[PDB]
Structure formats: structure tokens, C-alpha cells
RNA sequence: CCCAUAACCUUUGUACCCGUGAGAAAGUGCCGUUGCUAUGGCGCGAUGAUCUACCCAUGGGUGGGUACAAAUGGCAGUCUGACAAGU
């Protein structure tokens, strides 16, 4: 079927980071113009396309006097820089130099919400293809996954205890290499379920969940008639919901 | 040395201030504003652990600011700390004002005061960049030309060249330091008098400082970097002196 | 304007409200409300000595030109003061001239609102003169001589 | 009999009423400077009766200015109106204190029943209505002090510097190298869209060379399918057809074998071409823009070598100040033609110096410098 | 209202008495001539003091010193003849900026400091 | 988590490469204008003269570097394995 394509899935998460680092990057850069401008924004707020919205939203410091900054920064913060544009440390900013900006700002939503864009058509392509690992684990970890060692039929050869570890193999073959404790999480960790769990929990539900996902992942990459669905990855996720919540209810202070 | 050697960084005694220590030894202090370099100074930098962060040191030079003779020589307490307000007579330039607002940190201050334009130029761009120095580009024997603009300082450093330099001292002292306050003094013989040798140029000029209500602790002489001058540590008492 | 409206409402010692007021309009001359209860303290002084003069004749435009003066110098200082407020390129000055005019001209018609009250508004209107704005005053002109 | 004190904040002035004058003959008393420290007698010693704020930061700097030079301002008179008492010229001064012994001439120039006073006593108290700052005012003064006082300081170091955007090059440095991050990702891009698209179409991949048309063309043709006589002609309207590429796309496209890619691989690299084609018309402008703000600030860069050479220079300078104060024996810019080079560079450093301190060029002297290096060209 | 740049000028018995004083420098290898090297002096902290002429074509050439002049607080003064400088130079050709360089070593060194004194004074 | 989302080498793609400070070169030199000889321009410079591997007779192929690109080249191999928790 032409909708199974894990070369564009790789593509596609390699594309991710280097879009996350480029936009930070160029976040950078308004905040620096801005900066010789103005810089107390730069100071109470950091998130990027917020602090591009209110640049695209009022251009010069009486005209944050004039305006209503109610959707983009809740109203303190609001404030907060409507008392710093009374009372800045700057200047006054050329027209052209200001169109420049308004540019920018331009540039840096556009490539906010093609992000979440892309990543939409990730997660999308992502249930298509191996729905239950979608079902279970999270796409992001998925693609990351498949990303990391290589294509789907060879991630479903390898077995469990290898998907519990995967990532940190630099860590794993120096402890094995000076005898010390071998790592648990390694790549896993970016998973909702070992975010609800803690600690000695996180390793239990670590490799609870590489083996499960290692069962939804054979089932889902050498399957004739998948269902598209993922009852196999809901069952799983049930059946982790259960030990997870066992866990953490056993108690280990007396009663 | 070289720009790729590994070397350790150490707390002194003087907060702020560390020592890189590697093959050779460096003063070296903590920069506010990263990767900028502003007189082509050779800079360290390292990681910090969310991800590690990078901040970035900076050596003093020891040749060219007038104040780091004070922490090599060795000064017993130097009253700039981490969280004061620093009056300064005479910023040049960033070359040493800007390692003041590095040693001062982000919750103190520090006033430039400074009178030649261009030099007021290079200042507020570098003010422009770093938000805890503001310059003001007045004549220094003139506190009742600039009072609304400085609200009780902590310590003053004066490095003027001018013969004024006592009563300039004493000016500004007494209108903007808290009591019990610090000063610090980077005199230079061959710019008061050139006859009189240098020595008695100092105790001239210290006695002129305790006339004028400032009893002084101790005083650098700084040899080994520059040639004929002294550093005076004094402290503002403007009460029972003795 | 609680001083101002205790001594005029109870006692109408109007020299005295006066003097207030010079001093008000003297601390803050930027408050076009002060500006409006001053205007209004003017004309309720005018039409109180008129009934007066008017009830004396019945047991038997000095004062327009002093209100319109007293725009005149309010619409300057207004005008100014915008200007100061935030002051720097060609066309920004441009762009901020042609604000302000609108800034004070909406404050005219406000006054228009507050309101020989044809000749007074004729004369905000020459006043006035020496796009859109354009047809909205000569409108004015138009509709205040059917008025 | 020092009545009244007279303090100025960088929000507005503040008057003082005195209660118990201090017994003057001790001033240089332990007991009498300790009082002068602590809280607990200054509040003793002085009352608030009056402060009016400033409304707006350039009324403040330029009230600031007009007591640094020394006249009074309009703030100040009506103050000193509402405050000082109706007193005589002959007997029985009120009595003023007051920092600034030059400032003293206008305010006894104005009023004419008023004794200015700047003593060593006047100079106690104000010292002390500085220490004790902002805990005596109650409550009235709004906004912080140090913030106002930030701003009061960058706006007067400014107007008595004369300060300038036009003279400001930062906006030089910081467009030079956000261009040069635009250009990498705009060829990374091109690499990434010639792969994303060569799962579709390596004989594209082959067949055309620029980042642009290869934009331009996964912008117009959608796909190797769609493709069509006027789709043709728009491509030659486009790229070209008589270079024959258009010919030999659709014959490829009869003859390829790759994924015919589905409507959201389709949109997705439809995106994908769309956000390159607007960063590219983003970088074209901006990179205008640069050549517009150099003939603005130093376009005697731009006579001797060129917009985007000088650039690169300001930029590896730090500043237009650091270019200057550069010498001309250890520039670095990019044996014989280390001559040239040698020889531009000193023509260079001159350049920027003049550029630099010079407030608007002369480009007659850059056409001299640039019509002796030909002529230095013509010699070697 | 404001000074053209080139302040100070000096007196023509101030200019006299620099001409014979770089003179003699010149003589004794401590004159060195050229702005350029004087910006390279002043960036090794060899330079003692800098004269400067005022009729270069343009003067920003030679504007560009005062900044380190006043950076390290080195003494600097004007003459209005490049081509009487030159002269005092004892080169082929007028000269814009001139330094006399750093040796307590020798000849001239109480009239350097002399000059100096001037300079320092008419500041 | 400190980075296998890389780091280093190696293989291929892009490059040019051996601060000093007064010494270089050694009627006419080459033209222009004007006729019953007059003559137009220039002939060093402080604002800076000069110093910063290997072969083949102003070509190539070896030799070595740093700043940039690709590698399904290399270092380079994927944890343990039957009890636990309540009564």
C-alpha cells in the first residue's frame, strides 16, 4: 500500500529536530534586534511565538500604551511591559528597521505552526503504519525508535530486552566494559507511562512496557491483515494501566 | 595560553572573582553577557547542569586594568561584593567597567561617569548590551550637576588623573556613600606633581583623605604591572575617626 | 473639581473656584477632564450672571470669546503635549502630525458634544481649518447653519 | 531656621516641612551623625508635606536637564507657589534649603521672599532624605525608583551624547549573520526537498540543478502524473522548455518507476516547498535591505570593495569602531598578491576611519581611493 | 557651539619648541612617524606622547587617534603644518601623526618630560 | 539524559599555502596643443619601498592543513532471566 513508507517516517523526524534548532536560533536573532531596541520583553517572557506575536502585534513602545495585549500574554505580564515601555532604556527604531522586524516575527509564526503541522502529519502517518506502537507507546518515541535502528523489520527481529535499552548504548557498553551497573531506561524514558510512574516503578514499568511494545510491534510489522485499528496495542495498554496501578499502590512504610 | 588548553576554575577569597587555574595561572571573573568579547579578550567557557548550560569567564587583564593589580597584589577586603552598588570616577571604557558589572553581578549596579563624547559613545553601546551599567557623561567634579540620578551608592572606585583628584574624592563621597562606606583610589604620581617624588605625593594625598573624613586601611603600591602608582582602601566613617 | 463644586455648589464663591482652578489647570494642564469642568465652571458662572442680569431687568459675547480662548489655549497645550508625549524619522513625524491633528480634533468635537453656540462652533471651525475629516467639518459647517 | 527642604526624584519633586532643626555647633559630633544614620530621629527631624510627580519620561529627562543646567522649570514654580508661605523681602525670609548653590540665584531671582540655603546643615538633611529614600514617603510614590532611574539615566547619558541610530551597526552585525543562517538553511532545505522529492523523482534530481527552479518546479508540477500540454508551456513560462528539460521531465515521467505518492505525502511536500519559497523571498529582501542600510551608514565601504565585503568586515570587526581602531598592518581580509591586498587593506583602514568619524561620507575620496587602487592594478 | 575635532591647536611658540623637540627625537631612533605605527605604539604601550598635524586631506585619518589617546592616557597635541611637521620630521615627504616613543635611556628625556609638562598644562 | 539525536579517525567533495619599517627602479623619456618656436601631463614614497616543499622549459602530477559536505567505511559488541505481592 502506498501509505507505508518508513523512509519518509525518517525523513521526517530527522526534518523535526533540525526545525526545533533552526527556530530557536532565529528566535535568537528577533530577540537580539529587539533587544537593541527594547529588552524587557526579552526578560519577562521567552517563549518564542509569543514574544514574536506581540511583535507583530504593537511595533513601538507608545504604541503598547495604545494597544490591548489580552489574547497572546495574560494581563499581568501585560502590564508588566506596558510599565516597562513607560519607563524603557531605549530608543526610537527606524522604519525600514521596523518593517525588518515585523518580517521576522512574520517568519517565526509561520514556522511555529508548520511545526505543529508537521507533526501532525507525523503522528497521522504514524498510526497508519504501525498503529499499535502508536496505540501504546507515543509516536514520537515511535519514529524515534525506528529512527535509531534503522527500518521496521529489523526492529521487530531484534527482541526485548535490546528495546528496554536501546538508546543509551554509550553508557551501556562502557559499564560492561569496566563491570559496573548496566543502565535501565535508556530511550523509553519518553514514554507517558514511565512519566506517570517513579523510581524504582520507572524500572519495573520500563521493561514491563518494552515487552509489551516489543509484542505490539511483531504483531504490527509482519501482520497479512492488520485491522488498522490496534486492539492488540488497547489490550496492552490496559493490562500496563493494571501493573502500573498495582505498583504504585503497593506500599513500602508499614501500616 | 594557547586557545584549547583544559583548566579549573576556583572560588577566592574576594567573591566573584576566580582563579583559572591550568598550566599558568589567570584572574578570571563571570560574564553576563555570553561569547562577546569586548576588547578581543581570550575567554573560558563551560558547561552547567534540564540540559547543561553554557556560561562563559573571562580574564581580567592584568596589564591593562587599572584595578587588577588589587586582587593579584593582593588587597586584605575589597568592598566590592555580589550584591552592592558601585559609584565609578572615570570608566574609560568597557575595559574596566564592564569587569566591574561582571564582579557586581546582576542584582547590583554600577554608575560610568565620564565626561569625553566618544569615549560616552563606546559606553552606552556597551551599557546597550549589558543591563546593570548606566553611564552618565558629566564632569566628575559636579555631583550637584547629576543628584537625581544616583540614590545612595555602596562603594566608589576613582582612577581621574586630574589634580582635583582629594577634593573630587571628597565631593562625591560625601554627597552619594552610605556611611561606614568603601573607597577605593588609583593614584598616579606623574599626573599630580612631578617634582615631588611619588612617595610624598602618597602621604600628601592620604593625608589629604584623612582630613577630608576618610580614614584609610591600607595601600598597594603595584609594582610588578605598571610603574609608580598606589592603591588606597579607605573606609567612609564621617564619625569619630579615631 | 470636589474642591471647585463644594465652593461653587454651596457657597458660589466663584473668584475663589476660580483661583482653584487657575492653580489645577497650572499642576495639570494634560487632563482634558479638567479642561472640560473648567469650560463648564465658565459658562454655568455666564448663564447664572445672565439670569441675573436678566431677573433684574424683569423686577424692573465677552464671555463666548473668553470660552473660545480658553479652547484655543487648551487645544495648543493639548497639542503640545502629545507632541512631547513620545516626540524620530521624516515620515514617522509625519504619520504622528497627521495622529495627533486626529487625536485633537476628536477632542473638539467632544467639546461640539459639551455644547451664540453656532458662532462659537463657526468659530472652532475657521479655528479649525487654519480627508475624511475634511467632509466631517464641512458637514458640520452645513448642518449648524440649518441649526 | 532652615523651615523647608527641597528634594528631586527621578519621578518629580518633594518638599519638606522641618520640625526640630538640629542644634548646629555639634554637626561634627558621633551622637549627631548617628542620628543622621539611623531611622529612628531622621523622622524626628522631618515631615512630608508635599510631591509632585512627573507625568511622562520626557518630561522627566527634560526636567533633568533643566536643573543640570541649572534654570527652574514650570513643575518647580507652581510647587514652590503651592507651598511657600506668603513671607517679606525685608524681614523674615522664609527659609529654603536646597542642594544646588548654583540653582540658588533663579529660585531667589523668582521669588523675591525666599532665602536660599545650601550649609553643610542643608546637605546633612538631604543626605539623609537620600538614605532613608523611599521608606519616608508613606506610600505615595508609585513605580520603583530603580527602574525609573534606569530609564532617567540611559535618556540623559543619551541626549548629552548627542546619540544617533544612523551611527548604530549592530543592526549591521546581527542582519549579516542571520543572512548567513538564512543562506544554510535555505541550501539545506534545497538538499532536503531534492531527496523528498527524488523518492518521487531522481530524473528531477538529475535533470535540474538550482534549489529554486527545484522549488519553483515541486511548486508548479504537483506530481509526475498531472502533467499536461499547458503544463508545459507554464514550465517554459517558468524554467524553460527550449533547454528541452521540459520534454525530457515529461517523457521521465512517462518512463519513472518511483512511489506515485499519495495526496499527503503530496501536500506535505507541498508545504514543505512553499515554506522555502517564502523564506527565499524573506532572505532576497532582507539581503536589499543590507545594501540599503550600508550606502546609509558607511558607503565608503561599499565604493572601496563592496556592500556585502564590508559587512563581513563589520561583522568580524565587532563594530564599525573596532574596524577603525584596527591598524592597518594586522587586518586580515579576504607574495604579489599579497602585495594588493596589502595596499587595499591600508586603502581600507582609511576608509573605515573616515566613514567612522565622519558623519556622512565623501565618496568623491572613495572614488580617488578606488581609481588609485586600478591604478596600483595597472601598475603590478 | 561645539570645537572642530582637532582640539587642541597650539600656540606657534608651543609649535616651535615640539618642531625642534621631534627634531631631536629624530636624531636619537625615538621619533617613529606614521600613524599607523603610532596606532600600533599605542596598542604595545610604548608611546610617550603624539603629535598630530591639522591639514591632512581629510582629518578623520588622523581622528581616529583620540579615542586611544584618551584611552590611555597619553598626551596629544596639534601642529597646522603636515608639511613643517615633515620638515621637522627630516623625511621626504609631510608627515600627519608623529609619536615619540618610551626610553628613559636617553638624551632628550628631560626635555620630553618638559614638553610634556606643556602639553599636560594647555589640556 | 553528560549528548550513538553524536564524538573521533579514515575514505571521497570545496581551498589557498612556505607582522618589519626607508629604501626601490635605474629645445625631450613618451605623447599633446599652435603656426606665423611658443609649449599641455607626469615621472617613487610615511596616506608606507621591501621579507612573511618534489619533478619535469609563464602546464600538470606528488607532498602536507585548516573552515566547510557524503559514507550501509572504521572504533563497534546490544542487559540479567523465575519469582514477587497480600493474608
Same mark, same amino acid.
Given at each position: 500500500s502506498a501509505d507505508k513508507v518508513d523512509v519518509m517516517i525518517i525523513q521526517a523526524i530527522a526534518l523535526l529536530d533540525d526545525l526545533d534548532k533552526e527556530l530557536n536560533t532565529y528566535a535568537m536573532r528577533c530577540k537580539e534586534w529587539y533587544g537593541w531596541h527594547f529588552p524587557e520583553l526579552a526578560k519577562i517572557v521567552t517563549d518564542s511565538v509569543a514574544y514574536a506575536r506581540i511583535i507583530l502585534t504593537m511595533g513601538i513602545r507608545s504604541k503598547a500604551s495604545e494597544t490591548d495585549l489580552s489574547e497572546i500574554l495574560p494581563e499581568e505580564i501585560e502590564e508588566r511591559v506596558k510599565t516597562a515601555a513607560e519607563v524603557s532604556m531605549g530608543t526610537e527604531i527606524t522604519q525600514t528597521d521596523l518593517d525588518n522586524i515585523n518580517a521576522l516575527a512574520e517568519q517565526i509564526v509561520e514556522f511555529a505552526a508548520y511545526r505543529e503541522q508537521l507533526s501532525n502529519y507525523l503522528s497521522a502517518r504514524m498510526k497508519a503504519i504501525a498503529p499499535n506502537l502508536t496505540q501504546l507507546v507515543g509516536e514520537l518515541v515511535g519514529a524515534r525508535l525506528i529512527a535509531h535502528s534503522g527500518s521496521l523489520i529489523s526492529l521487530a527481529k531484534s527482541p526485548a530486552s535490546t528495546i528496554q535499552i536501546l538508546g543509551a548504548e554509550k553508557a551501556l557498553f562502557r559499564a560492561l566494559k569496566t563491570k559496573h551497573d548496566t543502565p535501565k531506561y535508556g530511550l523509553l524514558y519518553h514514554a507517558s507511562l514511565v512519566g506517570q510512574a517513579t523510581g524504582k516503578n520507572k524500572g519495573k514499568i520500563a521493561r514491563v512496557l518494552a515487552a509489551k511494545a516489543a509484542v505490539s510491534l511483531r504483531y504490527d510489522a509482519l501482520?497479512?491483515?492488520?485491522?488498522?485499528?490496534?486492539d492488540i496495542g488497547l489490550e496492552s495498554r490496559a493490562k500496563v494501566e493494571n501493573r502500573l496501578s498495582q505498583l504504585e499502590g503497593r506500599d513500602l512504610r508499614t501500616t | 595560553a594557547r586557545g584549547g588548553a583544559k583548566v579549573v576554575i576556583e572560588p577566592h577569597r574576594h567573591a566573584g572573582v576566580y582563579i583559572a587555574r591550568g598550566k599558568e595561572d589567570l584572574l578570571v571573573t563571570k560574564n553576563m553577557?555570553?561569547?562577546?568579547?569586548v576588547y578581543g579578550e581570550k575567554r573560558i567557557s563551560v558547561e552547567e547542569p534540564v540540559p547543561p548550560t553554557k556560561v562563559e569567564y573571562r580574564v581580567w587583564n592584568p596589564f591593562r586594568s587599572k584595578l587588577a593589580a588589587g586582587i593579584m597584589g593582593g588587597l586584605?577586603?575589597?568592598?566590592?561584593?555580589?550584591?552592592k552598588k558601585v559609584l565609578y570616577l572615570?570608566?574609560?571604557?568597557? &575595559?574596566?567597567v564592564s569587569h566591574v558589572s561582571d564582579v557586581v553581578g546582576p542584582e547590583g549596579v554600577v554608575y560610568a561617569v565620564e565626561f569625553s563624547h566618544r569615549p560616552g559613545r563606546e559606553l552606552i553601546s556597551m551599557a546597550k548590551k549589558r543591563p546593570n551599567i548606566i553611564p552618565i557623561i558629566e564632569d566628575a567634579r559636579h555631583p550637584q550637576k547629576y543628584?537625581?540620578?544616583?540614590?545612595?551608592?555602596?562603594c566608589v572606585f576613582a582612577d581621574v588623573a586630574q589634580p582635583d583628584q582629594a577634593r573630587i574624592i571628597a565631593l562625591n563621597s560625601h554627597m552619594f556613600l552610605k556611611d561606614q562606606g568603601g573607597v577605593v583610589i588609583s593614584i598616579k604620581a606623574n599626573c599630580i606633581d612631578? &617634582?615631588?617624588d611619588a612617595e610624598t605625593v602618597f602621604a600628601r594625598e592620604v593625608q589629604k583623605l584623612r582630613e577630608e573624613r576618610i580614614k584609610p586601611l591600607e595601600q598597594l603600591t603595584?609594582?610588578?604591572?605598571?610603574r609608580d602608582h598606589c592603591i588606597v582602601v579607605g573606609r567612609y566613617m564621617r564619625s569619630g575617626l579615631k | 473639581i470636589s474642591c471647585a463644586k463644594y465652593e461653587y455648589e454651596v457657597h458660589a464663591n466663584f473668584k475663589s473656584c476660580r483661583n482653584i482652578f487657575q492653580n489645577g489647570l497650572r499642576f495639570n494642564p494634560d487632563v482634558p477632564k479638567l479642561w472640560y469642568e473648567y469650560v463648564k465652571f465658565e459658562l454655568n458662572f455666564i448663564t447664572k450672571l445672565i439670569n441675573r442680569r436678566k431677573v433684574m431687568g424683569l423686577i424692573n459675547a465677552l464671555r463666548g470669546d473668553i470660552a473660545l480662548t480658553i479652547f484655543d489655549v487648551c487645544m495648543k497645550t493639548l497639542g503640545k503635549h502629545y507632541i512631547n508625549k513620545h516626540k524620530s524619522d521624516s515620515k514617522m513625524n509625519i504619520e504622528l502630525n497627521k495622529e495627533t491633528l486626529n487625536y485633537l480634533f476628536s477632542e473638539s468635537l467632544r467639546y461640539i458634544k459639551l455644547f451664540e453656540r453656532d458662532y462659537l462652533i463657526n468659530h472652532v471651525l475657521q479655528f479649525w481649518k487654519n480627508p475624511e475629516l475634511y467632509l466631517k467639518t464641512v458637514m458640520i459647517d452645513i448642518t449648524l447653519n440649518i441649526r | 531656621p532652615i523651615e523647608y527642604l527641597l528634594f528631586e526624584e527621578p519621578t518629580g519633586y518633594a518638599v519638606f516641612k522641618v520640625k526640630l532643626q538640629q542644634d548646629?555647633?555639634?554637626?561634627? =559630633?558621633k551622637e549627631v551623625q548617628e542620628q543622621i544614620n539611623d531611622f529612628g530621629a531622621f523622622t524626628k527631624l522631618i515631615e512630608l508635606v508635599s510631591f509632585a510627580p512627573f507625568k511622562g519620561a520626557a518630561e522627566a529627562l527634560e526636567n533633568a536637564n533643566d536643573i543640570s543646567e541649572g534654570l527652574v522649570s514650570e513643575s518647580l514654580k507652581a510647587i514652590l507657589d503651592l507651598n511657600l508661605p506668603k513671607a517679606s523681602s525685608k524681614k523674615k525670609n522664609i527659609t529654603l534649603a536646597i542642594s544646588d548653590k548654583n540653582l540658588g540665584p533663579s529660585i531667589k531671582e523668582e521669588f523675591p521672599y525666599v532665602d536660599c540655603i545650601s550649609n553643610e546643615l542643608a546637605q546633612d538633611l538631604i543626605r539623609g532624605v537620600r538614605l532613608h529614600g523611599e521608606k519616608l514617603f508613606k506610600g505615595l510614590q508609585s513605580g520603583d525608583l530603580e527602574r525609573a532611574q534606569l530609564g532617567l539615566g540611559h535618556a540623559y547619558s543619551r541626549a548629552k551624547v548627542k546619540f @544617533?541610530?544612523?551611527?548604530?551597526?549592530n543592526h549591521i552585525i546581527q542582519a549579516i549573520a542571520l543572512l548567513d543562517q538564512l543562506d544554510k538553511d535555505i541550501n539545506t532545505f534545497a538538499m532536503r526537498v531534492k531527496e523528498w522529492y527524488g523518492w518521487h523523482f531522481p530524473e528531477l534530481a538529475k535533470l535540474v540543478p538550482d534549489n529554486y527552479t527545484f522549488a519553483k518546479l515541486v511548486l508548479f508540477i504537483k506530481?509526475?502524473? @498531472? =502533467?499536461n500540454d499547458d503544463s508545459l508551456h507554464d514550465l517554459a513560462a517558468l524554467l524553460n522548455e527550449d533547454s528541452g528539460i521540459a520534454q525530457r521531465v515529461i517523457d521521465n515521467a512517462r518512463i519513472s518507476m518511483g512511489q506515485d505518492i499519495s495526496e499527503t505525502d503530496m501536500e506535505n511536500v507541498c508545504v514543505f516547498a512553499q515554506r522555502v519559497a517564502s523564506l527565499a523571498d524573506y532572505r532576497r529582501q532582507l539581503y536589499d535591505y543590507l545594501c540599503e542600510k550600508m550606502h546609509t551608514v558607511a558607503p565608503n565601504l561599499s565604493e572601496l570593495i563592496g556592500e556585502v565585503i564590508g559587512a563581513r568586515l563589520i561583522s568580524h570587526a565587532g563594530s564599525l569602531t573596532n574596524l577603525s581602531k584596527?591598524?592597518? @598592518?594586522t587586518v586580515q581580509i579576504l607574495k604579489n598578491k599579497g602585495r594588493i591586498s596589502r595596499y587595499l587593506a591600508n586603502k581600507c583602514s582609511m576608509a573605515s576611519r573616515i566613514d567612522n568619524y565622519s558623519?556622512?561620507?565623501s565618496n568623491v575620496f572613495g572614488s580617488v581611493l578606488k581609481k588609485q587602487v586600478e591604478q596600483r592594478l595597472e601598475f603590478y | 557651539a561645539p570645537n572642530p575635532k582637532a582640539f587642541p591647536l597650539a600656540d606657534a611658540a608651543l609649535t616651535q619648541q615640539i618642531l625642534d623637540v621631534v627634531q631631536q627625537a629624530a636624531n636619537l631612533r625615538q621619533l617613529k612617524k606614521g600613524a599607523n605605527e603610532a596606532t600600533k605604539t599605542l596598542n604595545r604601550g610604548i608611546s610617550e606622547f603624539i603629535i598630530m598635524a591639522?591639514?591632512?586631506?581629510? +582629518?578623520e585619518i588622523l581622528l581616529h587617534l583620540p579615542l586611544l589617546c584618551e584611552d590611555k592616557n597619553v598626551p596629544y597635541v596639534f601642529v597646522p603644518s603636515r608639511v613643517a611637521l615633515g620638515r621637522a620630521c627630516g623625511v621626504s615627504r609631510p608627515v600627519i601623526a608623529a609619536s615619540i616613543t618610551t626610553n628613559?635611556?636617553?638624551? +632628550?628625556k628631560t626635555q620630553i618630560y618638559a614638553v610634556k609638562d606643556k602639553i599636560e598644562t594647555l589640556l
Open positions: 501482520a497479512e491483515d492488520r485491522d488498522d485499528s490496534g | 553577557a555570553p561569547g562577546e568579547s586584605d577586603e575589597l568592598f566590592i561584593a555580589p550584591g572615570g570608566a574609560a571604557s568597557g &575595559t574596566s543628584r537625581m540620578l544616583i540614590g545612595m551608592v555602596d612631578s &617634582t615631588v603595584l609594582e610588578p604591572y605598571e | - | 548646629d555647633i555639634g554637626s561634627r =559630633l @544617533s541610530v544612523q551611527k548604530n551597526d506530481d509526475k502524473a @498531472s =502533467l584596527q591598524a592597518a @598592518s558623519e556622512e561620507p | 591639522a591639514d591632512c586631506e581629510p +582629518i628613559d635611556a636617553s638624551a +632628550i
